């Protein structure tokens, strides 16, 4: 009963960051070494937990959150960051315990003339609560006139396509991200290292 981390990190399809995908992991053995000994990841930041000790720790639930963002924005997937991604798309709590793992997906998620399939939320009235997921498409009032579901000057669609081309500066190349959260409640600890 091996954890399907393969399903998560090696997936063919990754979600848009605004409508980020969550896998709840339970009832499996997690060999964490297969991640951290990998050469495949360019960012591997862990908050409040060490990947080397997870191999003999049990948790009630582990959450795998996956999505695509551009290189420049990987640094916004951290507690206490601000910017479009942090504020309007995916928000870590201050006291986050988990790992932030990312890799360049230019070979898959770029194409000549641009991949535009990947979106982000550009506008919102207020910041996301931590781990909030907002899939509303209500017209955004940017000026002093109410929109009531009609686009115009200062009345915009809240989402926008990233433009991923293979020649793009690394800052503007697509990155796949997985975020692992660890949960330890007073219930059967079903997510265990091999030891």
């Amino acid at each position, epitope marked *: 009963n091996l954890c399907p981390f393969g399903e998560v990190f090696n997936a063919t399809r990754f979600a848009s960051v605004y409508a980020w995908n969550r896998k709840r992991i339970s009832n499996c053995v997690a060999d964490y070494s297969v991640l*951290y000994n990998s050469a495949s990841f360019s960012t591997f*930041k*862990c*908050y*409040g937990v*060490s*990947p*080397t000790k997870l191999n003999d720790l049990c948790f009630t639930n582990v959450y795998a959150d996956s999505f695509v963002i551009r290189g420049d924005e990987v640094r916004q997937i951290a507690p206490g960051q601000t910017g479009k991604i942090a504020d309007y798309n995916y928000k870590l709590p201050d*006291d986050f*315990t988990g790992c932030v793992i990312a890799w360049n997906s230019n070979n898959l998620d770029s194409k000549v003339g641009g991949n535009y399939n990947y979106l982000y939320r550009l506008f919102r009235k207020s910041n996301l609560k931590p781990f909030e997921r907002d899939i509303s498409t209500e017209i955004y009032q940017a000026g002093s006139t109410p929109c009531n579901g009609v686009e115009g000057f200062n009345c915009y669609f809240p989402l926008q396509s990233y433009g991923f081309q293979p020649t793009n500066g690394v800052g503007y190349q697509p990155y796949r991200v997985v975020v692992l959260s660890f949960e330890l409640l007073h219930a059967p600890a079903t997510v265990c290292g091999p030891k």
Partner: antibody
Amino acid sequence: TQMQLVQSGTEVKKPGESLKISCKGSGYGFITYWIGWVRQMPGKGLEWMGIIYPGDSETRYSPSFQGQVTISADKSINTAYLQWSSLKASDTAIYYCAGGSGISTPMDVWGQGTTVTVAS
Amino acid sequence: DIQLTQSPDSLAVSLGERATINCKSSQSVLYSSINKNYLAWYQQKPGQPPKLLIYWASTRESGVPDRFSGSGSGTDFTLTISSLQAEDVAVYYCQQYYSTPYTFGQGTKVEIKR
């Protein structure tokens, strides 16, 4: 062993000279590790200086050492650096680099330390 | 900013007896994600790097003898060496990793009573 850190030779410097000591992480999985510097002066306690994630060189200084030292890291050689611009007599001590594969993590790997001494 | 002070400063205990070391913090070091305290215990012998013995206040590190035991919650923690031995004589530092900047205690000497 997963990870061992190796530190630069012991340094015989004189006041005013600058110095940049090193700490090279040997092992697979270095991308996970954050390198921390600890200062311990002869007979005195451990003093935490700063920590750096070589992934993107995110460094944090303790208020006791902000602006008094700089902490670089070269991710491409698993090396972290502790540099001065002008060594004071103040600065004679042993310097430990210490690794934990995370932030808010216990430092489970310690180098041999490098002793720096600022006088003829 | 958290500050930790150990009690006592120094300590002498005869072979076979128990030594205990307090470490009280300015502010509580409990993660809520996982009901764990972010405090640890270091042993340093003359001419040696610090050795991690205890993390999460109460979990023993690999290659640390059974007699070493860490405990406490909130603000007050203790590290108790049952059955003191020859090769236990050293300085013991407590350390929090709840937040940066990381901070240590003043340290505590343990020696043999005779």
